């Protein structure tokens with residue numbers, strides 16, 4: 433079955449604010465940097481993956497340009513990586529150089545931002561969707577007692593309410609940077625507490641932080657991989673109107689979630 | 694046997710049943726990078742079937758035999774009668790429902806076969822609590838006019854729901870709204886591609902989680918979403934388990 437070992441695949445790579453990984457100006461020279469750019473059909477946003485762990489556009493290999501952090505990620509002649517192990521992509525969409533452990537990062541959200549190789553802190557700005565389909569996925573998020581996450585208090589808080597199909601504030605847009613955004617206000621992101629004294633999950637302006645990076649795991653949790661914790665209904669009690677971050681445990685069903693799209 | 698009854702059929706009891714069904718099916722499952730369990734393969738025929746009991750509003754029970762390799766119905770028992778699909782594994786009649794009067798149904802356990810014999814499609818077949826109860830009734834007495842459609846109902850509310858959290862959630866929505874539904878493009882695209890999605894997830898080990906082939910899954914707005922990798926929540930937080938495909 434040759435289908436179990438496909439030889440290549442061409443796709444796009446989106447991330448921070450739904451922007452795509454793009455070789456700036458389609459420049460083919462070695463060391464030609466890669467940027468965020470609005471997603472399109474151009475060949476310099478087409479990325480081909482191969483079983484040698486390379487990722488290629490315009491015939492050249494995506495690569496870090498330094499051992500230390502903060503340097504641009506670039507395309508370069510693939511023969512320079514002849515003996516290199518290459519790129520490893522985590523479950524959660526972290527794209528990591530296997531040798532150096534630096535990860536693909538977008539230090540700003542705007543078009544033409546240079547992408548850099550940085551130390552992994554599991555920030556949202558280090559989360560990528562490898563895939564041809566780059567759009568935010570509009571969904572409801574169902575939790576304990578079959579209730580729906582709703583954006584409340586003028587899109588500053590979030591808690592469980594009973595599902596109503598029309599209800600505009602029960603809809604979320606899952607973005608390519610692992611952010612969970614308010615569907616009718618895409619500058620606002622579901623966020624883990626920025627106050628040390630609180631575990632309360634809230635809604636804040638998107639900033640690419642660790643706090644706003646969420647992973648929908650196959651075990652049915654909503655995981656923040658930076659803080660090694662998961663979304664939980666406080667006290668397994670939906671009427672407390674509090675969703676918190678907690679270490680994963682099957683104490684009740686407060687940590688189980690469904691994406692309904 | 695694992696079971697579900699109309700006596701106590703709520704959103705909670707349905708969810709628990711589907712949850713435990715996934716557990717039984719994923720005993721001895723292998724796992725890949727995606728962390729979605731892969732069903733067992735090359736199972737000796739003596740251990741290949743999982744029995745599940747469903748009891749209708751008359752307190753009459755059918756026992757369905759699910760093949761643990763592909764999560765499809767091989768056969769079912771009602772009282773002292775049993776009924777095998779035309780594509781059940783040939784040795785299955787020596788292993789399950791042996792102390793019954795065995796019949797072979799005139800069709801396969803696939804939707805394509807059932808729809809041809811039934812002359813009615815999943816798109817036209819309502820799902821919900823009454824249709825669940827009614828299907829167990831029609832299977833119990835084996836009224837041939839309703840057998841095919843009853844399977845469309847139960848394969849979806851039990852096996853497709855087990856396979857896909859999105860489908861489980863459609864059923865939950867119908868249970869607590871007390872409102873029937875017919876499956877749309879979202880649900881049918883999932884059902885249709887379970888095998889292909891299995892192959893691609895397992896093949897993607899060699900391409901950093903990228904697929905060989907893109908799969909089109911529709912959302913609830915009837916928009917197609919191309920899933921060409923494991924990095925889609927509508928797949929990886931949806932598909933509960935996979936068909937074995939690749940070493």
Ligand SMILES: *[C@@H]1O[C@H](CO)[C@@H](O[C@@H]2O[C@H](CO)[C@@H](O)[C@H](O)[C@H]2NC(C)=O)[C@H](O)[C@H]1NC(C)=O
Nearest residue numbers: 494495496498499512513516518519529531532
């Ligand atoms: C991954 O990271 C390492 C850099 O830390 C790269 O390996 C080096 O590549 C440079 C530039 O060609 C060579 O001069 C060095 O000799 C290599 N050093 C080591 C430690 O091997 C590698 O190119 C990067 N790979 C990718 C795909 O980005």
Ligand SMILES: *[C@@H]1O[C@H](CO)[C@@H](O)[C@H](O[C@@H]2O[C@@H](C)[C@@H](O)[C@@H](O)[C@@H]2O)[C@H]1NC(C)=O
Nearest residue numbers: 456463464465466467504540544545546547
């Ligand atoms: C993005 O990469 C290119 C290629 O190395 C840099 O020239 C850019 O440097 C920044 O812009 C240049 C023009 C100059 O202003 C420099 O001092 C800047 O830091 C770089 N862009 C960045 C870092 O923002």
Ligand SMILES: CC(=O)N[C@H]1[C@@H](OCc2ccccc2)O[C@H](CO)[C@H](O)[C@@H]1O
Nearest residue numbers: 454455456457458459460469474475476
């Ligand atoms: C497709 C391409 O290579 N475009 C380049 C090129 O030009 C731009 C352009 C096209 C239509 C209308 C206005 C401008 O050069 C640009 C730099 O000036 C840039 O590299 C762009 O990506």
